[PDB]
Design a protein around this ligand. Sequence first.
Ligand SMILES: CC(C)NC1=N/C(=C\c2ccc3c(c2)OCO3)C(=O)N1C
Lengths: 18, 350
Amino acid sequence: VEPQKFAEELIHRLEAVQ
Amino acid sequence: SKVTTVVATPGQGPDRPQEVSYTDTKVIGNGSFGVVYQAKLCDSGELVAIKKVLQDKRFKNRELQIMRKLDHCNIVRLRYFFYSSGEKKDEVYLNLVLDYVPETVYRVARHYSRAKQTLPVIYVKLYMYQLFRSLAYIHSFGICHRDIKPQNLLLDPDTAVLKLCDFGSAKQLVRGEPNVSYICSRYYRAPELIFGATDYTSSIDVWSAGCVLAELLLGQPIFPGDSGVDQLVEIIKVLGTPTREQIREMNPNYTEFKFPQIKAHPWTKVFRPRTPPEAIALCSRLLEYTPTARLTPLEACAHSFFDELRDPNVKLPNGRDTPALFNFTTQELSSNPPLATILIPPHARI
Ligand SMILES: CC(C)NC1=N/C(=C\c2ccc3c(c2)OCO3)C(=O)N1C
């Protein structure tokens, strides 16, 4: 579950800079 | 001082080891890879750099086998090579005798940075051009450097000649074969590399060159960050959130995740208003999510941003003439031969 964990962290970061 | 003599094998020669003596041995570099010495040849009196690394001896050295195949004006040349001992006895050390080059692009750009000045466009044109020229060369052999960064770009302030170095992370990319994704230096990693893609091409070097070009214009790295996500956030903050097919081009495993859609920041607002449009244009066609959409090194050399270099009356700010920029070979032009019409000015061929 590497891409699943990676994507969540990215989405989280992108929701904050939105 | 003391004189050291070894039987060294010519790098680009027909494998005929000969005697080599040198003096003035001093360390000019230390790293986890090994040690780098400076030395002066007893024969010609020329300065060389000696990259001393360890070797398992059970297997062939990848860096060496690549360097022996390279002969280009913008790649640091392999003079000789030999084997010896050193720290940690009972092991074999590989010694690469290379052309000594005083400066690096990084240290030079760092000067103007702490001096709060801007690196003149003519040097941005000169350095970037010679880089792609080196990239065009090794790509024709299917060899990918994979560690393109300003630190690995050596400079001679007098002649303004660039020579690519450090092929320790270089690898001949075979189509349809797995590749390490934890390669490349941060700040200059391609987006597909950050996404963990193992099917990447040599176009990762083009992305790195794009980061270098941007850093030279901006005075600071364009995509800073400790982790992969950190860097990716910086990239997305400029290029905008990549489309689904752009994600497919990089890593298909991230195609269906629904990332927040962030508006791209205009390239003109990225750099200083003093920045030439051609530089901005070159950069936009360099930094692309889709690897195939990125310009080829040979294509980059023919960009209009380098038109000033093809002017007959061009001169270095120190008065000297520009280096050989038009001495393209056939192997070098193997990518796209009709480009010679642009790359080689009429006052060069005739
Ligand atoms: C920056 C150093 C310590 N790392 C390094 N130097 C290399 C080669 C080199 C080539 C030409 C030189 C030189 C060093 O110092 C001055 O001229 C190389 O492959 N690596 C990883």
